[PDB]
Structures are given as structure tokens and as C-alpha cells.
From a paper:
Treponema pallidum subspecies pallidum (hereafter T. pallidum) is a medically important spirochete bacterium and the causative agent of syphilis, a chronic, multistage systemic disease transmitted sexually, through direct contact with an infectious lesion, or in utero. The T. pallidum protein Tp0624 is annotated as belonging to the OmpA-OmpF porin (OOP) family. The C-terminal region of Tp0624 is predicted to adopt an OmpA domain architecture, but it is unclear what role a canonical peptidoglycan binding domain might possess in an organism that contains an unusual form of peptidoglycan and has a divergent cell envelope ultrastructure. Treponema pallidum transcriptomic and proteomic studies have shown that Tp0624 is expressed during infection, yet its precise biological role is unknown.
Further complicating the functional prediction of Tp0624 is the observation that the N-terminal two thirds of the protein does not show significant sequence homology to any functionally- or structurally-characterized protein. The presence of an OmpA-like domain suggests a potential role for Tp0624 in peptidoglycan coordination and cell envelope stabilization, which could be facilitated by the uncharacterized N-terminal region. To gain insight into the function of Tp0624, we first determined its three-dimensional structure, which revealed a trimodular architecture incorporating a highly divergent OmpA-like domain and a previously uncharacterized tandem domain with intriguing implications for peptidoglycan coordination. Moreover, compared to conventional Gram-negative bacteria, T. pallidum has an inherently fragile cell envelope composed of a chemically distinct peptidoglycan layer that is thinner and more spatially separated from the outer membrane, as well as periplasmic flagella (endoflagella) that are located between the outer membrane and the peptidoglycan layer. These ultrastructural differences suggest that treponemes such as T. pallidum may harbor divergent molecular strategies for linking the peptidoglycan layer with the inner and outer membranes to stabilize the bacterial cell envelope. Collectively, these data provide insight into how the unusual cell envelope structure may be stabilized in the human pathogen T. pallidum.
Numbering used by the authors: 63 to 185, 195 to 476
């Protein structure tokens, strides 16, 4: 609490960077008398905070390292092996007075190599590499929205026919461990990336993106065909001669406050298994880097509705239980939406009413109202056209964001 962590996932340079700062004034310490005790205390605090940063790294289209831990795909000791900062000094280079700082960097390949377990790779013009331009907003496969690509340790490349073109297991494992399956780049670097993709790369535009976490570029079949056409080009996949260009927001992911530990990921795993077992219709869950969002589709009730249907009583029961599984030290943002009724005034009020009713229903199930904030967005944030019943039902929803408090 006297110790604060700032951290950035630098996908462009392939490193996770952290700065841990000790506020001496807050910790009741003074320089130079307490330099050693203060420095040792910062070194004492650093391992757990660094561990939490590393859990936040996106591994693939669905999971972060913390999720993989929860699924027992990796061991906590493999992560803590990476948080030794004894090669770094405790300095006064902090921008704040009466502060000490400890900086630590870990290559992203150190995390990636924990997931490389395969033995051998599985398997026009000749090219020296593959350059995917995945900048901008990309249509999301299987959805109506368009979103930018997120970087991760193990992206996949799909064709528009959803043939799998590139995957971790296609890479020689030694090479996967040495320099990952891709490098992410910026158009502003004005680099050839000759090291990665040589002088004559195959330049390809991303036509879409796949994944819960929007990680997998989708490329035109004609472009996929070029890759698969020659041994020379197929060897590019085996060697990992692949660059993905993306936007700057994706290239530097700032790790938000506060940091969540392994227990957040364990609790989310429980929530997911719970919802999967309850099979509550039209309830989905997704995580951000330190939030969870439960989305309840086809919510029709409002603040002035009669006592809600039995079937809805059961669903809100399931939601309430799921929310509670994330523990007592959270708060909730409940946001209502409507389908496009061509009635903006009504949509505005209705979306607020929907969120209000959800909040009231949850507070009769043990979630104190002081923990809840409500908002309504009318039809202004659609996730589908409002043409069919099914698509209108998708828009008509309440999103519950679980936040640290
Ligand atoms: Cl001081
Ligand atoms: Cl030192
Ligand atoms: Cl996915
Ligand atoms: Cl509606
Ligand atoms: Cl209106």
C-alpha cells in the first residue's frame, strides 16, 4: 500500500516492464537512515506484485496466463520463477520525492515457452516472411461488431473459410521458444523487420478477426493459398517468420489498478463452470484485464413492471449467485440497453429502467445497493441490427461489470 506497481505489456518490443515505487513518507521511513530497510522492503513486496502482472498477459483467443493457471495448464512456481529482481537496483529515479523505485523487465517469450510442449512441428512466388496488416477495426467473426486486434502469446491465423492456416503447433518448438510464434509491429517503426520476414515478405491485409479476445487475424483465401502453395512458404510458418501489425493501443497494454491475483482467476473459473452447469439461457461472461462482465440477454422487465416472471426470478437467482462468487470486495456497474425502436426518448428511459430493475432485483438477493451503480445507453451501443426477433433480443440486455472496490 506504500508500494505501487506501474506495468506495461510492451508487445512491440516483446517485454513486460514494471516499476515498483515505495512512498517513504507513507511508510514512515527516511533517507539516508532507512535506505537499506526501505530497499529490502521493496524487494520483499515486489515478487507478489510482479506475479500478478504476469498473470494478466493474454495467451490466446480465450485465456490470460492467470486463466491457464486456474485450468492447471501451468504451475504458479513457473511464474514466480520469473519475478526475481535481484539483478536490478533500488534507486531514487522515481518521479516522486521521498520515493524509491525498483524496475524489472521480463521477455514475453519467457512466459510463452511455458506453453510450448510439442515435439515436432506439424504441416505462386517464394517469400521470405509474412506480414499481416491487422490495423484498425476488424469485423469479428461470428458477431456483428468490429473491433481492433489484441496481441497475445499465441495468435492463430484463419482463412475467410475458417481453415486454420497458422497455429503454435506448426512452429518448430525450439524456434517458438526462442522468438515466439510472431512479432508484433508498428507501421511507425518504418522497419523491414528483415530479421523476422526478410526482404521479400508476403504482405497480407487482415479481413477480420476471430476470438473471444479478438486475437486471430482472418485473411483472404487467396492470400492463405499463397502461403500453402510452396515448401518455401510453408517453411515460413515452421520458422515463425510472421509479423502482425496492429494499433498502438494493442502494442502497449497498461496494466490497470488494482492488480488482481490468482484468486480472481480461480473465482472466474468457478463462475464459468457454475454458469455452464446452470445453463441459464442468455447469460454470458467475459473478462477484462481486472474486471468481469456478465451480460444478460433478452431482459424485458423494467422498474414499473409487475413482479418478474418465475423464469426470470430463476435467472436473476443464478446471476446473483455468480456475482457473489467473486467475493465481498467488489462493486457493480449495471448498464441497460434496448433494441432500436426508432424511439430515442423511450429507449433512453427504458434502458435506465432496465438497469434499475436489475439492481433492485439483485439487492433483494443480498447485494447491497451501495455497491451498485446504474446507467442506460438506449439503443446507442448495438451488438446486432434490430431486424429479427433474435437480434433485437440480443440488443435488449443488461451488462453487469464487476469491479474491485
Ligand atoms: Cl526521504
Ligand atoms: Cl540496491
Ligand atoms: Cl475463442
Ligand atoms: Cl427493447
Ligand atoms: Cl423519440
Amino acid at each position: 500500500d506504500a508500494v505501487h506497481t506501474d506495468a506495461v505489456q510492451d508487445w512491440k518490443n516483446g517485454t513486460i516492464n514494471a516499476q515498483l515505487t515505495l512512498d517513504l513518507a507513507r511508510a514512515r521511513m527516511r533517507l539516508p537512515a532507512d535506505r537499506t530497510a526501505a530497499s529490502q522492503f521493496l524487494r520483499y513486496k515486489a515478487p507478489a506484485q510482479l506475479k500478478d502482472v504476469y498473470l494478466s498477459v493474454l495467451v490466446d483467443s480465450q485465456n490470460r496466463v492467470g486463466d491457464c493457471l486456474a485450468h492447471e495448464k501451468i504451475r504458479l512456481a513457473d511464474i514466480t520463477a520469473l519475478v526475481d529482481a535481484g539483478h536490478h537496483a533500488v534507486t531514487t529515479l522515481s518521479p516522486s520525492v521521498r520515493s524509491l523505485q525498483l524496475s524489472h523487465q521480463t521477455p514475453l517469450t519467457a512466459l510463452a515457452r511455458l506453453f510450448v510442449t510439442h515435439e515436432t512441428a506439424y504441416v505462386s512466388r517464394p517469400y521470405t516472411g509474412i506480414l499481416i496488416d491487422a490495423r484498425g477495426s476488424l469485423p469479428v467473426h461470428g458477431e456483428y461488431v468490429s473491433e481492433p486486434l489484441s496481441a497475445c502469446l499465441f495468435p492463430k491465423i484463419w482463412s475467410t473459410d475458417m481453415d486454420l492456416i497458422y497455429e503454435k503447433n506448426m512452429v518448430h518448438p525450439d524456434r517458438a521458444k526462442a522468438w515466439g510464434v510472431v512479432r508484433y509491429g508498428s507501421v511507425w517503426d518504418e522497419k523491414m523487420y528483415r530479421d523476422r520476414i526478410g526482404t521479400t515478405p508476403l504482405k497480407i491485409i487482415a479481413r477480420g478477426v476471430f476470438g473471444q479476445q479478438r486475437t486471430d487475424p482472418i485473411i483472404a483465401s487467396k492470400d492463405a493459398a499463397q502461403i500453402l502453395a510452396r515448401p518455401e512458404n510453408l517453411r515460413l510458418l515452421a520458422e515463425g517468420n510472421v509479423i502482425i501489425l496492429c494499433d498502438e493501443a494493442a502494442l502497449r497494454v497498461h496494466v490497470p489498478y488494482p492488480l488482481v491475483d490468482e484468486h480472481f482467476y480461480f473465482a472466474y473459473h468457478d463462475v464459468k463452470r457454475f454458469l455452464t452447469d446452470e445453463r441459464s439461457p442468455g447469460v454470458g461472461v467475459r473478462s477484462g484485464i481486472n474486471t468481469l462482465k456478465i451480460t444478460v440477454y433478452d431482459v424485458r422487465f423494467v422498474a414499473n413492471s409487475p413482479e418478474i416472471l418465475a423464469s426470470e426470478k430463476d435467472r436473476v437467482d443464478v446471476i446473483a449467485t455468480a456475482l457473489k462468487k467473486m467475493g465481498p470486495y467488489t462493486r457493480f456497474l449495471i448498464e441497460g440497453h434496448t433494441a432500436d425502436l426508432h424511439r430515442p426518448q423511450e429507449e433512453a428511459a427504458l434502458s435506465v429502467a432496465r438497469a434499475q430493475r436489475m439492481a433492485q432485483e439483485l439487492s433483494r438477493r443480498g447485494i447491497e445497493m451501495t455497491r451498485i451503480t446504474t446507467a442506460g445507453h438506449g439503443a446507442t451501443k448495438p451488438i446486432a441490427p434490430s431486424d429479427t426477433h433474435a437480434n433485437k433480443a440480443k440488443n435488449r440486455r443488461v451488462e453487469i461489470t464487476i469491479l474491485r472496490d
